[PDB]
C-alpha cells in the first residue's frame, strides 16, 4: 500500500483497502463492480446539507436524458450553472455515488450543478455518452430558465472519466460553435488511451486506481483503436489548432495517480494553444480524492475542494 | 528563457528579462541589488486597496523592532493575525517591495498581517533575523490588543527565505513552548542549505531565481557550515521527533523553481511527523509568482493567491 510521501490519512485508507482484499474490481461483472462503489460511498457519514435536488428529464440527442439539478438551498433567482459529468471509468458511477462531491461543488461555488445521467459502458460504447453529455449541455444553454439557471453562464466539470467528458464536451462545443462556455473544471481527468506515462508506470498498483482498472475501463468504453485515436476519446492527441479558443481550465491532479502525467500534459497543451490554464498538483494525494467519501475530511482534500468551488464561482459571475 | 510547459504570460516575462540583460544580481552590491527589486516592483500598476497600514515599533529581543501592521479596511474589533516574513534572499526585500503580496493575503483572508522589519544580510547574519522574527511573534501573541489583533489566533506566513523564516519561527515556538500557532503558510520556502536536488539541477538558470543567486543569498546569510546544519537554518534537516506537533501547513511550490523539491520534501517530512500538511505544486509557474508584481494578473497566480488567503482564513476562525 502507498509510498513515501502519501498523506497520513490517505495512507491509512490504502492500508485498509489492502487488508481484507476482495477480488480485483476489473474481475467483477459491471453490476457487482457498481455495487462496490455504491457500498463504499455509503459507508461514511457525510454532510450533504445546503442543496435542493430535483430530477428533470429532457428530450435531446433524439432521446430522453435524465438530469439531476442540484441547486444551492434557499436562493432565489436564476443562478449560473455547471454541467457535472461523473467518473467511475464509464462502467461505474451514478448520481448518488457522486452526490457528496457534487454537493461540495455546489455549496462552495454558489452555482447550480446539472448532473447528466449518461448511459454506462458496456451497455453503450463511445461515443454514446459524450454525445448525450454534449446534447444536455446545449440543452441547458438554451433552456436554462426551465430549471432555474442562467444558461449563458455555463461551465463543465467532472472527475476522472468525467473530466475526460468535460474536456471533450468543451471540444464538441468548439466544433459545433455552441454553446459558449465560461470554464472547464477537470478533476484528475483521463486524457489519453495509452498507458506508458511515468505516472502509469510508477503507480501501477497500490494506489487505489490501478493500471489494470484503467485498461478494463477503456476496454468497456471501446476497443475500436481508431475511435481511441480521435480527440473526442483521447483529447491529449489534439493539436494546438484544435485546442485554440477552449474555455479557461482548472486542472487538479494527484501526486500518486496513474493519470497524473496525462492530466498535467493536457494542461500544457492547452497552455501552448493559448488557453488560460491553472494546473495544480496536490501532493500526497491519490486519484480522485474529491470523489472518495472516506477521504472527504482530510485537510488537503478540503483545501482542494474549497479551490474547486471558488474557481467555479470566479468564472460564473455576471459580466 | 523558460522551458516547455511554462505558462504563457510567465514565459513572456522570462523572455523580457533575458532581453536587455543587465549584470547578474549576485554581482551587485547589496544596495544596488535592493534597488533592482524596488524598481521592478514599482514598474507595474497594482491594486493595493482595502487595507489600513500603520507602523509600530516594539521592544523585544532586547532591541527595537519595526512592524508594519496591515489591517483589512473598515473593519471593527480585534481580528486574528498572521506574522509576515518577507523574502529576497536575506539580502533584498522590505515592506514596500512586498506590499502587494501582503495586501492580497490580508484582503483575501480578512486577517491582519504583521510585517516584521528584520535586519538584512550581510549587515547581520544568522541567527539575528530569525531571533527578531520569533521575538516579534511572541510579542504579538502577548500584546496583540495594542495593535488591534487577537494574539491567541496567530499564524506565520512568508515567501522564499520568508517561508524559511516562517517555518523556523514555528520550530522556535515549539522549542520555547510558546506562542501557540494556528497555521504556517509557506510560499516557495527555502528549506536546506544544499544545492543538489533535481529541481536545482534542472532550473539552474533561465527561470528568474538562479542557483547562483541562491548560493550568494546563503553566503550573505552565513558561511558558517555548522550554522547551516542547524534546523533553524535548514529545517529540512529536522527529524520526525523535532517536527512533531508543529502547526498545520500549506506549502505552495512552483513547477519551475530550483527550490521546488526542497519545499515539497519539507512538506513530506512534516506529514511523516504527523503534522497536517497540504502541499500544492502550481504547474507552469516560476519561483515566487506571488511576490512578482508583473505576474499578479496571471490567472493561475490569482488562483494561488485566492487559495493562500482562504487557507489563512480557514485556520484563523474562532474556536
Ligand atoms: C477499488 C476498490 O476496490 O473499491 C474500493 C473498495 O471498497 O474496495 C473503494 C473504497 C472506497 C471508496 C470507493 C471504492 Cl470503489
Ligand atoms: C478513471 C475513473 O473514472 O476513476 C474512477 C473514479 O475515481 O471516479 C474510479 C477508479 C477506481 C475505482 C473506482 C472508481 Cl469510481
Ligand atoms: C478536517 C478539517 O476541517 O481540516 C480543516 C480544513 O482544512 O478545512 C481545518 C479547519 C480549521 C482548522 C484546522 C483544520 Cl485542519
Ligand atoms: C532577477 C532580476 O534580475 O531582477 C529582475 C529584473 O528586473 O531584472 C526582476 C524582475 C521583476 C521583478 C523583480 C525582479 Cl528582482
Ligand atoms: C530565495 C529568495 O528569497 O527569493 C527572492 C524572492 O523571490 O522573494 C528573490 C529571488 C530572486 C530575485 C529576487 C528575489 Cl526578491
Ligand atoms: C486575470 C484574471 O482575472 O483571471 C481571472 C482570475 O482567475 O481571477 C478571471 C476571472 C474571471 C473570468 C476569467 C478569468 Cl481568466
- CA distances to A137, B171, B279 from B180, in Å: 50, 11, 22
Cα separation, B135 vs B206, whole angstroms: 38
C-alpha cell at B238: 529536522
Instruction: Map chain B to HEC letters.
Output: CCCCCCCHHHHHHHHHHHCCCCCCHHHCCHHHHHHHHHHHHCCCCCCCCCEEEEEEEEEECCEEEEEEEEEECCCCCCEEEEEEECCCCCCCCCHHHHHHHHHHHHHHHCCEEEEECCCCCCCCCCCHHHHHHHHHHHHHHHHHHHHCEEEEEEEEEEECHHHHHHHHHHHHHHHHCCCCCCEEEEECCCCCCCCCCHHHHHCCCCCCCCHHHHHHHHHHHCCCHHHHCCCCCCHHHCCHHHHCCCCCEEEEEEEECCCHHHHHHHHHHHHHCCCCEEEEEEEEEECCCCCCHHHCCCHHHHHHHHHHHHHHHHHCCCC
**Cell 440527442 -> residue:** A61
Contact between residue B25 and residue B34 where contact means Cβ atoms under 8 Å apart = no
Contact between residue B113 and residue B147 where contact means Cβ atoms under 8 Å apart = no
Using CB distances shorter than 6 Å, the residues near ligand 1 are A 17, 22, 25, 36-37, 40, 208, 292, 294
> Residue B295 contacts by C-beta under 8 Å, 6 or more apart in sequence?
B9, B10, B13, B286, B289, B301
Contact between residue B229 and residue B235 where contact means Cβ atoms under 8 Å apart = no
CA-based torsion, A199, A204, A210, A215: positive or negative: positive
Indicate the angle between helix axes A95-109 and A30-41, nearest 10 degrees.
Answer: 40
Cα separation, B309 vs A25, whole angstroms: 41
Q: Smallest Cα–Cα separation from A203: which of A285, A113, A317, A281?
A: A285
Tell me the sheet residues that pair with B59: B64
Helix (H, G, I), strand (E, B) or coil at A125: coil
Cα separation, B47 vs B100, whole angstroms: 7
- Tell me: cis bond preceding A179? Omega within 30 of 0 counts: yes
Cα separation, A305 vs A59, whole angstroms: 33
Cα separation, B230 vs B236, whole angstroms: 10
| Closest residue, chain B, to A278 (C-alpha) | B300
Cα separation, A267 vs B133, whole angstroms: 39
The CA-CA-CA angle for residues A194, A196, A201, to 5°, reads 130
**Cell 500584546 -> residue:** B143
Of ligand 5's listed atoms, the one at least distance from the Cα of B287 is 7
Cα separation, B220 vs B36, whole angstroms: 17
Contact between residue A81 and residue A102 where contact means Cβ atoms under 8 Å apart = no
Of B281, B300, B306, which is closest to A310 when you measure between CB atoms? B306
Å from A254 to nearest chain B CA?
10
Q: Was domain A1-319 assigned CATH 1.10.3470.10?
A: no
Cα separation, A247 vs A233, whole angstroms: 19
Contact between residue B159 and residue B190 where contact means Cβ atoms under 8 Å apart = no
| Cα separation of the two ends of chain B | 48
Q: Give the residue numbers in A contacting B (CB under 8 Å), as ranges.
A: 4-5, 7-8, 248, 250, 264, 267-268, 271, 274, 276-284, 299-300, 303-304, 306-307, 310-311, 314
| Cα separation of the two ends of chain A | 48
- CA distances to A111, A165, A232, B33, B42 from A128, in Å: 27, 11, 11, 61, 55
Contact between residue B185 and residue B155 where contact means Cβ atoms under 8 Å apart = yes
Strands B79-85 and B277-286: unpaired
Contact between residue A143 and residue A275 where contact means Cβ atoms under 8 Å apart = no
Q: Give the residue numbers in B contacting A (CB under 8 Å), as ranges.
A: 4-5, 7-8, 248, 250, 264, 267-268, 271, 274, 276-284, 299-300, 303-304, 306-307, 310-311, 314
Indicate the angle between helix axes B128-143 and B161-176, nearest 10 degrees.
Answer: 60
| Secondary structure E strands in A175-230 | 183-187
Which residues of A fall within a CB distance of 8 Å from B279?
Answer: 282-284, 300
CB neighbours (10 Å) of residue A57? 9
**Cell 483521447 -> residue:** A234
Cα separation, B7 vs A267, whole angstroms: 10
Cα separation, B276 vs B297, whole angstroms: 30
Residue B200 has, within 13 A of its CA and on its CB side, a CA count of: 17
> Residue A271 contacts by C-beta under 8 Å, 6 or more apart in sequence?
A277, A279, B5, B7, B8, B284
Of ligand 4's listed atoms, the one at least distance from the Cα of B25 is 3
Pocket of ligand 6, candidates B285, B295, B299, B303: which has the most ligand atoms within 8 Å of its Cβ, to mutate? B299
Helix (H, G, I), strand (E, B) or coil at A265: helix
Residue B19: is it exposed, middle or buried by C-beta count within 10 angstroms (0-12/13-18/19+)?
exposed
C-alpha cell at A276: 488560460
Cα separation, A97 vs A34, whole angstroms: 10
Of A279, A283, A299, which is closest to B267 when you measure between CB atoms? A283
Resolution (A): 1.7
C-alpha cell at A248: 479557461
Residue A64: is it exposed, middle or buried by C-beta count within 10 angstroms (0-12/13-18/19+)?
exposed
Contact between residue B244 and residue B271 where contact means Cβ atoms under 8 Å apart = no
Distance from CA of residue A306 to its chain's centroid? 16
Picking from B4, B5, B282 by the largest number of A CB atoms within 10 A of its own CB, the best residue to mutate is B5
Cα separation, A306 vs B312, whole angstroms: 13
Amino acid at each position: 500500500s502507498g509510498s513515501p510521501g502519501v498523506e497520513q490519512h490517505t495512507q491509512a485508507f490504502l492500508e485498509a483497502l489492502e487488508q481484507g482484499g476482495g477480488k480485483p474490481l476489473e474481475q467483477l461483472s459491471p453490476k457487482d463492480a457498481r455495487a462496490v462503489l455504491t457500498g463504499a460511498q455509503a459507508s461514511v457519514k457525510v454532510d450533504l446539507s445546503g442543496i435542493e435536488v430535483k430530477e428533470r428529464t429532457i428530450q435531446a440527442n433524439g432521446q430522453s436524458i435524465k438530469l439531476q439539478v442540484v441547486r444551492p438551498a434557499n436562493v432565489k433567482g436564476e443562478l449560473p450553472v455547471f454541467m457535472f459529468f461523473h467518473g467511475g471509468g464509464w462502467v461505474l458511477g451514478d448520481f448518488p455515488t457522486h452526490q457528496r462531491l457534487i454537493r461540495d461543488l455546489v455549496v462552495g461555488s454558489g452555482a447550480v450543478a446539472v448532473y447528466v445521467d449518461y448511459t454506462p459502458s458496456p451497455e453503450s460504447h463511445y461515443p454514446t455518452a459524450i454525445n448525450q453529455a454534449y446534447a444536455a449541455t446545449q440543452w441547458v444553454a438554451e433552456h436554462g430558465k426551465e430549471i432555474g439557471v442562467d444558461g449563458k453562464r455555463l461551465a463543465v466539470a467532472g472527475n476522472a472519466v468525467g473530466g475526460n467528458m468535460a474536456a471533450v464536451v468543451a471540444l464538441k462545443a468548439k466544433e459545433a460553435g455552441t454553446p459558449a462556455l465560461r470554464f472547464q473544471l477537470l478533476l484528475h481527468p483521463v486524457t489519453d488511451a495509452s498507458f506508458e506515462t511515468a505516472s502509469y508506470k510508477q503507480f501501477a498498483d497500490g494506489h487505489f486506481l490501478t493500471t489494470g482498472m484503467m485498461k478494463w475501463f477503456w476496454d468497456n468504453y471501446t476497443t475500436d483503436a481508431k475511435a481511441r485515436e480521435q480527440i473526442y476519446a483521447s483529447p491529449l492527441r489534439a493539436s494546438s489548432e484544435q485546442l485554440k479558443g477552449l474555455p479557461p481550465a482548472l486542472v487538479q491532479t494527484a501526486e500518486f495517480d496513474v493519470l497524473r502525467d496525462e492530466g498535467e500534459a493536457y494542461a500544457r497543451k492547452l497552455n501552448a494553444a493559448g488557453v488560460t490554464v491553472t494546473s495544480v498538483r496536490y501532493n500526497g494525494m491519490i486519484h480522485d480524492y474529491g470523489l472518495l467519501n472516506p477521504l472527504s475530511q482530510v485537510p488537503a482534500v478540503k483545501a482542494a475542494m474549497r479551490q474547486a468551488g471558488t474557481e467555479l464561482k470566479v468564472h460564473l459571475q455576471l459580466e
